[PDB]
Design a protein around this ligand. Structure first.
Ligand code: ER4
Ligand code: ER4
Lengths: 332, 332, 329, 325, 330, 328
């Protein structure tokens, strides 16, 4: 009871802002627990700055660029946000304090990722995503680097093999899969917010304005685009399996696998589904197993791949591509 | 990689609803070996099941099926069944069969050979005694359990004992087969197929189809309970078999189907719904899945109690049902 | 196998809806030893429950129960309780008890002896203070956690450190017992039994039975939340105790009931239904058979409670504090 | 950081017996134990500097724990060999403040309590055997306790390890009593007396009389009585070591204990103090450590002269250690 | 327990190479093995006492196992060094009876069968190599068998350990043969002969001749032949050790075996064996507490012997043969 | 047992004094696989070493050695080396090789091939740069560590992760190789070959053979310390690699040699004997568990550190790498 009330506040913020990762983060072994919790909170504060449209580009860029350094400015905080999670910015001193209490080896990793992410975020403030190549670049900045950072923390803690943090491509794929999935799922919500994440070079081959997919008379063209993007995302699954297969720590495995499975289940539920453009989407041998051991995770993944495979319209324009990537996933 | 192997996995996912995923999740060489084993048995079953194939043509097909595995160009183009693709493109499947290590080939062909003979033996007859019921189930399921066990031991992912104890392996197949036969009474009766042992049901009604008559519901349920009680006798062997597995991917593959079958019997016990369509596959279970032996034991024991709780003193098999469950409870 | 052993397992399933399966799933010798431990405790509990047994007749039965384990012909035929069969056919159970290895016998007899003293002590009084609550729960459940832990170590399936940690083993039992006491308010009130601590409920109403009256539902829910908050304080010990276990069958046996109790408090928290009857119960992509998963499940249930805490509730700050402590460390 | 590198440089320059096993500890325990050692090294250096007046030393020992939080604190007036850890204390304190809070609380608490005890024995010598235990508690028992709390706080060892302070105390006492008994001569030729007065007085008038040849006979008897006292801690030592589950921690704890026991077996009834199966097993697993311990107990037992005033007691404590389990 | 405390005093009093690893055994094995050792010590002390007439000795050996259940039994007429365990046998037997029946059963059965064998060799010397194995079985092989049965009975080790009496017998024979080889001179000077006559008679007329300087070269050749014979038990020793799972049991078993192997390597082609006592580098970095380390140590000692084999030695081929088998057996 | 397998182990013991014992102590299938691996590599090395074979003849023998494993009758009767028995009786060895499971044969052949190629590359040239020194060491040692790591995983006694780490497995080999090279300076000098990197020694004396002359002893020990400082940089990889192992037999096999090498570098550091002939807590624990191996390593690092002359041209470097190892 004597210990850090500032750390208790950090865990309060974690549960306040994260519905999908708080439980598995708090379940991580030893040192990984606080390091990952803090990593999530600083990223949350950085993301809130990027998302706040009341902050002009001119004022925002320097904040994004120096955020990694604010981690070492004890009294720094930001009181001008109107975003829902602004509490992490207004009470950033409590968070940076605990960040500075982490072992240096973890601080180095977190700061490096924050620095790089800030640079990438600034880069995209005055431009939308065009090519699929730019889509990967953007996803790398806001998610790929997170997978890389998390992996570096795992190896640094010694709970996982040095290889985990070294193979940045596989770590990058973990983040990209989760990011592309959410982006595909949150089309309608993002569109109603003025933000666009779907690659221009893809939706433009369907409609004149991305926002057109929101209108009923374009539902067909929309779903087709939806399926092309989902097909794109599926290409990360082989890396995801490789990455998970290298994990040896149960708490880390649960942390990494559960979110990936939920993401795969989301793509399966969105595939060739019109509800993606009308609102939010929602949820048998798999119901017998959880995503806590590799063979079960593989089984769960394959079930979802077949669920998508048998719904692939010969009609749809991505049919051949979708079947091909699923076959690649199946034949190991 | 291989175009033919990718094709095999495509056929596996297209034909197997409940085994495709756990199969694809199997470690190393077991994966292709079991995938191919499933496909060849699927082709064999498709031939036996095709009523447009005369007995004159069918007996030779069933007896020699195993040898077609060795003939590069063999295929069957006269099937009128839904899964005929595996027969018409058998060369692709047999090619992969011949690519498997010789030790796996020995197992698969031996089983196909013995299964073919057995199926041929039953083309002209229905099941009479309970002994004949066991014989039939051995031919179409027990031998499969035996084959799988031999593949596991041959691959060395499991100890030699798994493949050597054919009676325990046979019990695994019999339990699944009997459970399916009991559950599918109505669907089969409407398909002109009879699998319930005649020496058992003849003690209740004159025609097996009479159980579908509302005025015979009481006798039908009594018979149902007698057959379920019969199947419960395989449980001790199932627990023994599963308790011997050391490979997680193999455990998942074997344990899940057994748990689903047990859940099914529990849902069917003393349930009139069995004779009015498919049944409702209905505590301390909720918090645990079937991926570790102790949990599997607990789930199995819980289902035995669901049955025990419903045993009416007036049922003709009540004492026998209590007796076998009591044996399952007490055995360590 | 043995005729008498078959009978014991028959009795286990007759008197246990939530433990029989995980007990039967225990490895080697723990199976029979835990089955027998359950049965003798069921018998002791039935004697304590029977209101048709005068207190002066009951005190010796409770004090001497442990010695009856060594009396081949001892049985009790004057009970009218629902589980009386274990008392009327106690010779069958004591026989199997005497068939257990001596190391298990010693632990079981010792716990029965100590529990008997505690139950006898509370026959003429109700739980007053929260400290008294902990004491009564120690007698009927804490000692059981301690006994079970010693059985685990005795069997060698668990490290000696498991049985040695009597403090946290005690917390494992207290948590399950308090949870049941909280949930079973109405059931016990209509049975003439009172388990809610008087120093706590008297700050709300004049009679514990008053919580049954619809016009006190508000006060009732406040006391409910205060008791739940008290119970939550054992979770840190539970997590520490579970984290030490290395045998899968033992882990399932201990972890599942704790998670089920946690799920129960979450469902009962700030729930008016507790006073009108029974209350029924990431989290789905993981079950409770590995420690990290059990932690995640517990944390999800804690947020379930945290998010529903009313500012007006008199225990609100205390409730947040303990959940915060659980989350943070 | 260079500051953490400097800390390990000091660790190696100051510790002959623990530097290696400390650096071999798993994860978090490594830096926490390294820092704990350095701060204790700095405190002991202050405690031993005779050029520091009492009125100046007492408050320093009492307030040492507080310097851990003062970024700029350092001591520039020491003439001791390891004065570098005092002159560059800011480097050590910086790394202490970088440790997780749970380790900081333990280290600070122990330093505060040891400083109190050290100041208490500046103006006096050890008289009774009870005072001897009190003195050893302050300079060593508390160290075992501190270390145990760190092991438990790191989660590498069971909660019980840090909670059982008596067993932890015994670990420290056994090491300290062994070094005190062994270093008799060196201490006398240094102006310090650590052997309990109520013990040596029963053999001579002045503790320094043991050095003179004409008293060697009485010196060895006193020597054997003290060793017999020390042996009483072995049961707790076995109990403590038996609870360890982390190999790096076991090595760290077991090796020094065995070396200490080997030392008492060498000093038993040996005049130089005042002037089998073993070779096939090392101290890296509990059963081996036990075997080794029993071996040394017999080397001592087989050498208990019936004429020695403590003969009976010595035999009794060895007997208790043998029949334990 | 004052009586149990006395038993451990005797153990340390009589055992120099086993008391430490015995006292380090986990749980119930500790007292069971301690008692087992004390009873055998007493039995061996009687068999050794030459002041006891044969007609008076045979009964003692044959009925020794029964004295375990005779609370007051004891022997006051022994003049041997370890007579304390006999004079105060009541203390020892008391603790024996405090042991779990399953342990008592094993111990008494071994004492019985051992007593039979000892009595049998009271009037004869060891002739054939077959009889040497027989003799060693009676005084050591059965001990390995009894100990293994105690391990399995305690459940600290699998049932196989106590079941494979062959491997267990081999464990005992290797230790006994090594000690018989090493203690030639001491035994000879003590008036006892343990070397097999069919082996030594091929070199000299009397076993005692090996104690004469003039026969030193023949003595060494016989020595090498007997060592070559003992080496044949190594395969079984490795197999037996590789099946153990309890660390305290492993140390108890491995240390004495490694020490015996070290002893044979030191005695091989060594004249010192007939003049006095023989005192026992990748090995440097290893201790005998983990199977792979134990294997490595054994292999090193084998090459130590192999490298010293004389071309002209009458057993050279056999020695290289068994060593080669040990090197190759996986 | 097969007489051909017994013969192999006979040769193993004949040509190995520090590896035979730990090889024979390996679990299951690793035992014969590693034994055979050692034997073939010994043959290959013997060929390179033989100065009676012309470069025109040697090259082919090196480049194709990996193929001789599948040629039942292949052998070599023209060697003058001490271990020619392995070449002259290679058929006995290839036979057992072909008895190994395919997964082991693959690994072994691959390494032999890549090794032969690399070896032929230095038949005429000497070691120039340190970069080149690692290159040569990678060929005769580095690749061996990789092959071994792959056999551990192939056997499955070790996690797939072990074989995957080619970089640290390579460092394991380079560390042992540089140590033997540094130590055997004089023997290799009085033997004909030069392995010390030219770029390094040519900065102290004009002829590498000059270190053998008393009027250079000082310059000698200085170059010595500089090389040891180079080899020390591999220790962090060694510790990391060893820390991953889970099989006791494999750990003992890998750990003992690394520790023996470290002890060797500590004995040679700032030691003159290197240019003439040959050359507590630690004594309480052996190299069979990782924490003990760390402790032993650290004690040796201290033995070298407290002997670092602040005059030596490497003093700064030596302290820097040791500091890194200590705080790692
Ligand atoms: C490591 O400890 C984990 C904590 C488990 O804690 C507890 C605490 C109490 C009980 C209980 C009980 C009862 O005696 C009370 N009544 C309900 C069950 C039985 C018989 C009548 C039980 C149930 C129980 C009792 C005996 C054997 C198995 C389970 N568990
Ligand atoms: C598990 O098998 C491992 C092989 C151990 O084999 C053996 C064989 C013989 C003995 C012995 C003996 C003696 O009876 C003979 N003499 C010397 C020691 C004692 C008393 C007199 C001993 C010593 C012994 C006897 C009883 C208990 C423990 C050890 N060990």
């Amino acid at each position: 009871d004597s210990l850090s009330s500032s750390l208790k506040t950090c865990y309060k913020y974690l549960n306040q802002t994260s519905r999908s990762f708080a439980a598995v983060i708090q379940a991580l072994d030893g040192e990984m627990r606080n390091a990952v919790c803090i990593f999530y909170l600083v990223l949350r504060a950085l993301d809130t700055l990027e998302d706040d449209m009341t902050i002009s580009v001119e004022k925002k860029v320097p904040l994004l660029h120096n955020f990694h350094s604010f981690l070492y400015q004890p009294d720094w905080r930001f009181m001008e946000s109107k975003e829902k999670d602004r509490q992490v910015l207004e009470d950033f001193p409590t968070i940076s304090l605990e960040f500075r209490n982490l072992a240096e080896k973890y601080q180095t990793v977190i700061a490096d990722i924050c620095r790089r992410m800030g640079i990438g975020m600034a880069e995209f403030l005055d431009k939308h995503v065009t090519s699929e190549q730019e889509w990967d670049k953007y996803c790398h900045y806001v998610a790929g680097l997170v997978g890389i950072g998390l992996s570096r923390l795992f190896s640094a803690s010694e709970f996982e093999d040095p290889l985990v943090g070294e193979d940045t491509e596989r770590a990058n794929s973990m983040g990209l899969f989760l990011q592309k999935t959410n982006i595909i799922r949150d089309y309608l919500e993002d569109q109603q917010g003025g933000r666009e994440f779907w690659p221009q070079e893809v939706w433009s081959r369907y409609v004149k304005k991305l926002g057109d997919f929101a209108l009923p008379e374009n539902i067909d063209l929309a779903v087709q685009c939806l399926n092309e993007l989902i097909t794109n995302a599926l290409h990360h699954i082989p890396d995801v399996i490789t990455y998970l297969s290298r994990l040896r720590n149960q708490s880390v495995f649960n942390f990494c696998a559960i979110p990936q499975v939920m993401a795969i289940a989301t793509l399966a539920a969105c595939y060739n589904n019109q509800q993606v453009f009308k609102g939010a989407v929602l949820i048998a041998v798999t119901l017998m197993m959880d995503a806590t051991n590799m063979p079960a995770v593989k089984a769960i993944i394959y079930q979802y791949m077949e669920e998508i495979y048998h719904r692939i319209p010969d009609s749809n324009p991505s049919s051949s591509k979708t079947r091909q990537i699923i076959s690649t996933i199946r034949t190991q």
